[PDB]
Each structure stands twice: as structure tokens, then as C-alpha cells.
């Protein structure tokens, strides 16, 4: 038979089978994790014979008993076949070997499950007879895979090994520990050493067999041919795998027969040619979203969202038309559009903003008429010239730094100089020390001398030097140059420290900035109310709105409502609110942190009942109803004070379902009695005249410690990601954090939150349902809070807008709009469905085959309405599908003979015999797959040749995965600029100098090479720990979040750890990290194919014999065949030189390539300086053909001076001006259009020969 046999195997060994079940079934359920850990210590699971008969017991338990529904049993089986949760188990294997062992300083007598209590080791299960001691970085770090079994005054850990039966009692020892509310418990799994080197045969991969000789109406003959073989989903794929072979059959048995000809009312109504916008229940997907491992990690949160309302009283069809609705295009189109704000200084008392423009009284604008009607009748793309104040701008300035001062000095004084009919001004910021001392001179000069002098100093300060500490002798100049016209109050001189220039103005300078929160991560600008972020580029946001203000006001003019007696600045400040609560109206207006309120109060039977609730009385209407969750620390003066103001807020509105869950600071102080102080007097709640009435009820009530209450909280706080002591106000699911004090959210802000939330989410949730037919499932605040939390997970993109490539989640209703007949059908379960893949795929596509095979496996899920379409594209001149696919994805757990863990692989029967097929690996974008188990060729897979070469038509080549990426991106504060040049050494306690990948210009790119394990990330001592400092390596989103200062990253998945750290400057120095304050000779070369390998080899032999010195080597792993890998150490000993191998990965933002040749030149010249680590300098790549007779000394010993690089790698100049990082954006501009490169490894560096030297 003619069949290549390709399997994929992970480098890391197989985890035990019982615990693979124990993590997929009990993944995130705090309850379900410790329950499946009891049936093994009972007998049920510890009874099994083989690996088949252990999974079996799980399923019937996780269905009839009360774990999971059957429309997820098959999904459990599927993830178990794909071994998805397997790397998660290797994090415990690694934490033990790299952190648990360095503390473990004793003898394992035979105490299989040695306990960890109070920094001491106890082999004995009764505790008070030790065996060892705990060292440095304590294991009591709350790692997110040893979940919280209640809480207590002392934190305890155990390392159970379930493969051994000795775990049964030792596990039960600390089961009672947390039960009686005495201590906290968590189970971290143990390395079972009795295991074999059983390889983890990974799947979720595709097998590409490209055609090198590819170049010796078809997408319509084949298109009409699937609705002719009468197998709508099974026969669609039976073309998608071997299309390059099955092209002749498209000329035999009425293959044309244009019936789907009238079915060309598809593109001219919904979507153009040559694209596949795969729909998921309402939202749009991309490539980095539609694949194997990167898709099921997204099919469960939608599942949770949907059923949330089929309990309230709806269906899966009446949920897709409810989420993909007209009113849900407000979940995103609403928060970005801001509220009006108040900036008037007359609340401070006219003492803060200082003005450059004075439009009405200016003696430079008199040329215009002072009447209002000037703007009413105005024409042109430009601005309405007038002598009256309509527009206002306020810009804060950090006087010590030169970046913000430069703006008044230039930016503002340019718009004033260029006659803009807008009033520009600013406030002298008073935050970081010195800018306060340099703000008094600004007020001294303007009140006591005039506008000239203050501005003069500012400019003349910037032009001369830029005074860090206010300069006096340059101030004497400004005095003795403009000392005339001292209006209001007269001179003081030199030492400013009086009762006004010093006092009033600086105090009220801070009063006004705090009232509208600007001083921080975002130095926020203003303009006729509405906020403006200055975290990167302010110029765009206020300028687009600038044109939109005048035509908005013109409508009021058109109607005459604008009287001649009306102040034009105080027009946009009519709605306007006092204090901008940033928690309600964020900086980044597209970022609503909402965790489904229905998902919270539903699997926590004690915590969601023992809460002092005040229902939204049935005395009032429907839209008032809302469940303001108030989770706060009532044992603190800035946590119990918000509880009483929220209570007071309920008094005013009968639409408040109040919640007062105690969030205690003190862990030994069992929460329940504090909650019982408010649950005892819950009947007559919010009937308290003063705060003192609430403060006397928290002393009277020494209740019994209900330890059952504190354990359900330990299941809620972890799920909702919450902190203790610090507070968070919630309404229908919307978190505001970190509520430092009760001043951040007074009662006069509880209404403001109800305004915006009613506006954006509350009201439209009822309107979507009113024009639908199910308006009777809005039971009180309850349903309405579940609805306003389901529709919030629709506008939350999985990927922050501006990294991978946009991914804007938009829920619309056009997916199902297309006449559904010829190329249309709905295979699978429909009305009783859970996941709704209403799809639209074209058969002529490079990855459309992969999606046909991925969605085949997702279709096999119980209750899926995978609707399928078929748009017939025509735009092709050469072969559309140049490759032979086969997707390795299985639903029912793959099981072997006596139940062993079976291998999911790929095969090609009856495949072509006279075409070379390049075996390439298309698998999630974080897999350092390398070829290691082969005998034949990568570039050469003719079937007729191997039929003789090895003796049969079969192939026994097996590829090997060895690395799971940690791809990420670095940012900066204030400006989110690129932190490039920074050197970072990712490291564990056990493995110090491990690996280092530099930050690059493309939004601070980095990607660390590692396998499942617990890591941290250092900056190497060169320049980093002097001018740059990482506050938090953002392992938890772009955010930020008050509980993620974690400079620790742990990996145990497939897609890597998407790390978004927030590196910040040390205050002071711009001074770029990219610029300065084994052997002496080395060489690298590229290779692909057994023939390419041998022509490379003779170059290595004719380069370690001609020269009298030491030469190391640096070729690239995956391209090389296993034939070559068992060859280099041989020539490295008899000749006497050194091997070593380097490799990297093209990110999801950089132009990938089709045929494996263009790929090679991408990695060769752009990926150069990052391939080799920092502990190197000179490399001498020479093409895999030449021979070096020369002494290789006058190749390293060669002056370059400005020239970075058949080349001369100088990793000192290559890091100084970052020519590799430059060639990245150089290739980005000349790869979109193939109208610039014949080749890319010798034409990209020669185009920039004058700029980037040789």
C-alpha cells in the first residue's frame, strides 16, 4: 500500500492516566476537583485494571451522580483524546524537580505523601514528629493548580501521588483539617517515578505535503460536485485532503452541472469572494482563533453563557438571535462614546487653570463679530472663525520632565499663534516633588507680572537647559526683562514661600486634578467635558472630536434653542457630572471587566444564601431592578462605610437587590460571625439614621463561628479573582477596582454608576427581548443581572485590540441571511443545540481545508448546529491547493490493546508517486516541532523512489515536538512605547542562566523557549537594572489588575503564556538601552534536505583545518533531517570542533510563508541577532557550497565601524543599532506586495545599503 506514516510526540513524558481524567473533568470547579479525589480513596477508582477501565468509571459518575451534562461528556472524551490537560500535570512534575526538591533536605523513609505544614515536613500523619526542613522561596506560593480547600489561620500543603495506594489515608488526614474551619488545604500532585519513558504522543496537528513541481473554473466544478455526491459533510472533506490529486475527476460524470448557478445571490447580498468569516453564535473569528487547541479553550465560556438563560426560560435559537441582535451592537458601541464632565474652576474658587487664549477679550481676535449666529451659518472643512468662547481644552503638565512641558512651550503656543477659535489652557501639575517647587514661579509670574513672564520662563527654561530644580539666575533675567505692568499684587522676589503664590494655588492645583483624575498612568487631557487619554498619542482623539463639536452645537442653532443670552462654553457642561469615577468610565473605553453574575450565585449554596440581601421590593417597575453586589471588608473604616452608603442608595431607589458579602482581612477571624452581625439584623435593614447605627451592630453579635460559610467563599473569590481588605463595588456583574477608600465611590457615585450602566447595558437588555417574544423571563433584578452579564461576555474580545491583528468582537444578525438551498444545509442537532457554528467557507483556500477538518471534529460534539455554506470563488490562475492535508483530531478517547494510551497519527493512502512532498508542520503558533524520528527525506517524498530505496511504499517517519512557547509583548508607562534593547534572562530557582530573548521594536516582542514548568523573569545586569524596571510582568492581561504584580510566569498549556508585562522607566533618564553608556571564531549555516546537508558538511571540514584556531558551529534544528543529527558529534571529536543548535519562531504578526523556501530567508537575515544568545559576538555564515582555504582569523579580526554585517555578524553593533530589529519592519514593508523581492536574504539588506551597512 502507498502510505507515509507520520506521528507527533512531545519531548516530556506521559502523566498518570487517573490524574489526566481528574484534571479534564475537574478543571476549574473548586468543588468537583476535591470530589473526584475521594472515590479513589474510597475504592471506586483505585479498583481499575487497565487505562481503559479507569476512564470508564469517570463518565457514568460525571453524568448520573451530578457533575456534568451529556452535551459536554463527548467534549470531555474529546479533550481526553487530544490530551489537552496533559502539560498541566507536568507543572507539578517540574515544580517538584526545580522548587520542591531544593527545600526537601532530608530522607524519604517511605512517607509517599510527606505533609507540608508551618514550614516543617512531617512524614508521620498525626504531626509533632518531623523529618526535614523548608528553605527559601516557600512552596506556600498559591500556584493555580492546587486549589483552595476552604481557609484557616495556617496554610497547609500535601504532595499526594495517586498512582500509589498509600495516598488513600494521608489525603483524608487534611480533609478534616479545613472541614472544622481550622486550616487551609491545597493538593499539588506528585511525580510518580514508577512511570516509564512513555512518550506523550501529541495530536492537534496537520500534515502538509506541498508540491515542489506545482507549476506544470475548477473551484466551481468541484464546488457543484459536493452537492452531487449526496454526502454533505462527509464528502466535502474527502476532497479537502487530496485536492491536488483529485483534479482529473473534475472532468468525468457531469461534474459541472450548474445547478448552484441561480444560487449566486450570496456575494452580492452578504460576503465577497476569497474569504471565510467563520461565525460563532454571533461573533467573528480569525486564523489564530480557528484551529485545534486554540478553539476548545473558547467553546466552554459560551456554553456557560447560553444555558445561563435557558433556565430563565429561553432556547438556543432564541439566544443566538438575542445575542446576535441590533441592541447588542451597544455592548461595544457605547462605552467608548463618553459622558459630559465639569471642569469649571469656580468649585475650587477660580484658582487652578491658567489660560493662553482669551478669545472674547484678546485684542487679537477683534477682526470677528462677537455674535453667536456667526457659527450657526458657517461653511468649510476648516473652523468657524469667531471672537467668542465655545471650545475649551485643559492639558496637565509635569514641569520636571521635558516631554509634557514641551507641549505648552510648543504644541499649545502654535494653535494660539495659528488663530484657532478654540481656547487652550493648562494646569501646573503638582505630583512628583520638584514640579511643585516649579509651579509657584508660574503663578508668581502670571498674577504679579503678567502672561508674558510666566510663559517666557517656560519657553526660556526649555530653550536654555530645562530646569529640573527651579533656576533663580535665569529667573532674575525674566524679572529684569518684564518687570513692568505688575497687576493685582506687586513684587516678592527670589524666595517664593508665602500665603498665596505658594499656598492657595498649589493646594487647589491638586484639588482640581483629583476631582477629574488625571495625575497617574494616564496624564488625562480635557476638552468641553469628555475625557482624553495621554498614554501614547493624544493628538488624534481630541482633533477628530474637535470638528464634531461645532456641527453638534449647530443643530441647537438651527432650532433657535440657543438664545443670544447663553454662555457658549457652559453648553457641553449642562449634563456634566462633578467627579469622573474612572472605575465607571475607564481610560481605555473598550475594556469592561465583567464576570457573569449568574455564574457566581448558583454553585455556592451557603455563601449566596447567608448574605444580608435587600430585595428590590415589588412596589416599583421593571427597569429599576438591578443587583448591586457590594463585596467589602466590614472590619475596616474604608470598607464598612461603603456598605452603609450603598444601603442609603437602596433607600432612595426600590430597584436595588443589595448584597453584603463580608470580605474579611483577617483569615483566622472566621468571616461568618461578622456576616451574622448583619444577617441577624437583616429583617429591618437600611433603617439607620447615621453611620454610628451600623457601627454599633458590628460589635453586638458574637455569633458562633460557622466554618461552613468560610469554605464556599474560598470557591467564589478564586473563581471571581478577588482580593481581601481592598474592595470592589459590583452591579449586575461589573467590577470596579481597587476601591482603596469609601471616598472613591461615595453615595453621589452610586447613582452615576446606575446612570452609565442603565444607559449602556441595563435598558437595551429589555429592548432586545421586547422585539423577540420572551419578555416574561426578566424575574426581578435576578434575570436582568444575568442578561447584562451574558451580553458583556460578547463585547469582551479574547485578544486585546492592537496586538495579533484587531479581532473586534461584534455580534450581528447577517450570518443566517443568505438563500439556503444548493450550497446550504444544517448537518447535526439543530433545535436542541448548544454551540451554533453558522459557517461560510469557500472550497478553494490555503487553510480552508484545515477548517473543514477542525470543524468536522467540533461537529461531533453533542448538540451542535454547525450550518455549512459554500461560496464558489473564481480568482485563481495557478493551483489553489498546493498541499495534501490530513487533520489529527479524535472525539472518543483513542485506546490501545490492554487499554494503553493510544497514538493519534496521520497517513496517506493511494497518494501520488512522482511528486516531491515537503513534510511541514502546521500546528498551533507555539510549537517548536523538530524532525527527529526519520530515515527518508523531508524535501523528497516521491513514492516510486522509496518503493526501492527502503523496500516498500510505506514511510515510518515521526516528527517530534520539543518546545511550548511563551510568546508575549512588552509595554511602557507613561507612553506605551517599545522597550527594545532590554536583556531578560527567564529563570527558575533550580535553572539559573537558562535563556534570554531580547525585546524588539514591534510592540516589545519576546518569546521564551520552554516546556511545562514554573518560571520567573530577570533583567540581566548590563543596562536594564539602571534605567529600566519591571513593576509587573503582566501574566494576567494588558489590564492592569491589582492582583498581578506577579513577576512569575508558569506554563502548562499549548498556546504558550501570552505575557503582557508593563515595564516602566526609572524616573530620570531617556538614554536608550539599545545604545552603550568558548572560542574567538564561530560560523553558522542553513540546511534543508539530505543533499543540502552533505554540501554543507564539506564546508565544515574545509574550515576546521585551514586556520590555526578554535571554531564553533550554529545551524538550525527542525530543517535538518534526523539523518544529519546523528552525524555532527562524530566530526566534532576526530576533527576536534564544537556543535550546538539554535532555533526560533515566526510570531502571529509577521508574514508567514507558503512553500518552505521563502520561510528560510525570513529566519536567515531578520532572525539573526536573537537566534544566538547574549554570550556571543562574532559569526561567519558562508553559503553551503564554498570551501575556506583561508585562515579564519582575518574574518573575525576585521574593522567594521558602523557596519553590522557571506557576512560579518558583530553582535555588539547588531545590538547597538538593532539592524535585525530594523530588517523586521524593513521586511514588513516589502512583503505585502511581491513587487520588490526576487529573493529576501540577499535583496532586503542591499536595498538599505546606504542606511544599514555591510
Residue numbers in the entry: 28 to 243, 292 to 1152, 1197 to 1324, 1361 to 1409
Sentences from the study reporting this entry:
To probe the functional role of the “clamping” motion uncovered in the present analysis, we engineered four double-cysteine CtUGGT mutants, CtUGGTG178C/A786C, CtUGGTG177C/A786C, CtUGGTG179C/T742C, and CtUGGTS180C/T742C, all designed to form disulfide bridges across the TRXL1 and TRXL3 domains, clamping shut the cleft between them. The presence of the engineered disulfide bridges in the remaining three mutants was confirmed by mass spectrometry. The crystal structures of CtUGGTG177C/A786C and CtUGGTS180C/T742C were determined to about 4.6-Å resolution. Both crystal structures show the TRXL3 domain tethered to the TRXL1 domain by the extra disulfide bridge. We tested the in vitro activity of the three “clamped-shut” double Cys mutants (in addition to the activity of the wild type and the already published CtUGGTD611C/G1050C) on urea-misfolded bovine thyroglobulin. As to the UGGT clamping motion, we tested two a priori rather similar double-cysteine mutants, CtUGGTS180C/T742C and CtUGGTG177C/A786C, both designed to clamp the TRXL1-TRXL3 domains shut. Surprisingly, the two mutants differ in their ability to reglucosylate urea-misfolded bovine thyroglobulin, with the former mutant more active than (and the latter mutant having similar activity to) wild-type CtUGGT. These observations point to the possibility that each misfolded glycoprotein substrate may depend to a different degree on a different subset of UGGT inter-domain conformational degrees of freedom. The three motions are to some extent independent of each other. These observations open the way to the cloning, expression, and purification of Cys quadruple mutants such as CtUGGTG177C/A786C, D611C/G1050C: these mutants would block the molecule in a clamped and bent closed conformation across the cleft and the central saddle, respectively.
Central to ERQC is the ER-resident 170-kDa enzyme UDP-glucose:glycoprotein glucosyltransferase (UGGT). The enzyme selectively reglucosylates a misfolded glycoprotein on one of its N-glycans and promotes its association with the ER lectins calnexin and calreticulin, thus mediating its ER retention. The full-length Chaetomium thermophilum UGGT (CtUGGT) crystal structures revealed four DsbA-like domains (TRXL1–4) arranged in a long arc, terminating in two β sandwiches (βS1 and βS2) tightly clasping the glucosyltransferase family 24 (GT24) domain (Roversi et al., 2017). Overall, UGGT's motions can be described in simple terms as two rigid groups of domains moving with respect to one another.
